[PDB]
Amino acid sequence: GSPNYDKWEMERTDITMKHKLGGGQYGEVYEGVWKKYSLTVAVKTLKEEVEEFLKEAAVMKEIKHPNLVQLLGVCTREPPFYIIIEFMTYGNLLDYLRECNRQEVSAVVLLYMATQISSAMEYLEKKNFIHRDLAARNCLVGENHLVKVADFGLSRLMTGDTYTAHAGAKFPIKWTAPESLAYNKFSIKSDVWAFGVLLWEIATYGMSPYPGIDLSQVYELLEKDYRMERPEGCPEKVYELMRACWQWNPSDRPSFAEIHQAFETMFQESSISDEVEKELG
Numbered sequence: 001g002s003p004n005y006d007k008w009e010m011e012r013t014d015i016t017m018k019h020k021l022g023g024g025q026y027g028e029v030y031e032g033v034w035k036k037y038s039l040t041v042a043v044k045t046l047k048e049e050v051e052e053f054l055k056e057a058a059v060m061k062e063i064k065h066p067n068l069v070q071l072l073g074v075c076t077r078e079p080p081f082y083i084i085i086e087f088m089t090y091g092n093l094l095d096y097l098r099e100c101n102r103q104e105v106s107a108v109v110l111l112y113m114a115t116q117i118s119s120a121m122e123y124l125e126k127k128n129f130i131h132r133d134l135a136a137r138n139c140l141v142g143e144n145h146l147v148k149v150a151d152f153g154l155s156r157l158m159t160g161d162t163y164t165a166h167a168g169a170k171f172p173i174k175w176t177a178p179e180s181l182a183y184n185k186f187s188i189k190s191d192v193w194a195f196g197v198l199l200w201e202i203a204t205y206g207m208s209p210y211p212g213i214d215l216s217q218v219y220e221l222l223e224k225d226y227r228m229e230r231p232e233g234c235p236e237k238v239y240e241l242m243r244a245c246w247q248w249n250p251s252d253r254p255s256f257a258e259i260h261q262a263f264e265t266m267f268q269e270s271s272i273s274d275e276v277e278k279e280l281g
């Protein structure tokens, strides 16, 4: 074989760069086209640090799942570096929920979304990886309400049961578990907490978490056992799972395996009524 062959490396000239996607919401991530195959793609690059970029690229080569956005290739031999990923046509979940028709995106669709996401996290959990940035803004939407988890910039394969982030490092307060906020300690359980917040975002069709409350007051409130209220219309079972995800002690939070099982079940039962209803009109 050829000496410098690398299965993941693509020629940067193969890609046409267009414009930043998500309205620049995700930084240097552009919509591009893999000319050879007339395929629209998402390309993350580095402005003119690298270590984190290369780490993100390496992690994406190791994970593969139906509900995890798929790495297509990279350009990391020389700058500018690229990470070429499949493009999800309906954008991110947060904006999708904020602009959707609710008769279309009904209760069964919200359950379907949660099910797909928990499926991706169960896979990651099994592989001992942590995501560290679960949020609706970081989930993507495809045709027929297909949903995939994205943005693996902070994802890590753990060696132990916990990962301690750099010192002085700071995180998205409203999606971050108590022990993460206070001691920079992360784990599969901290992702579970974030998933609970994501569920709330889904249930509210994209509302910003902790309505009214000041970020500076969030931790103190959680410490006294305050937790967001059940959204209008959220089934009790779902709110209960939500509250379990927000148990103060990480060990008390359920596993993604358990979470996925619960949602698959609710989705299927909810789905039956949906199919029937559909078949009346």
Ligand SMILES: COc1ccccc1-c1c[nH]c2ncc(-c3cncc(C(=O)N(C)C)c3)cc12
Binding pocket: 020, 021, 022, 023, 026, 029, 042, 044, 069, 085, 086, 087, 088, 089, 090, 091, 092, 137, 138, 139, 140, 150, 151, 152
């Ligand atoms: C969270 O997604 C990411 C975070 C970091 C790095 C890559 C991605 C990413 C991979 N494939 C994608 N596909 C579509 C969008 C996307 C999201 N929001 C809006 C758009 C958009 O502009 N339209 C028109 C769909 C696209 C974002 C990504």
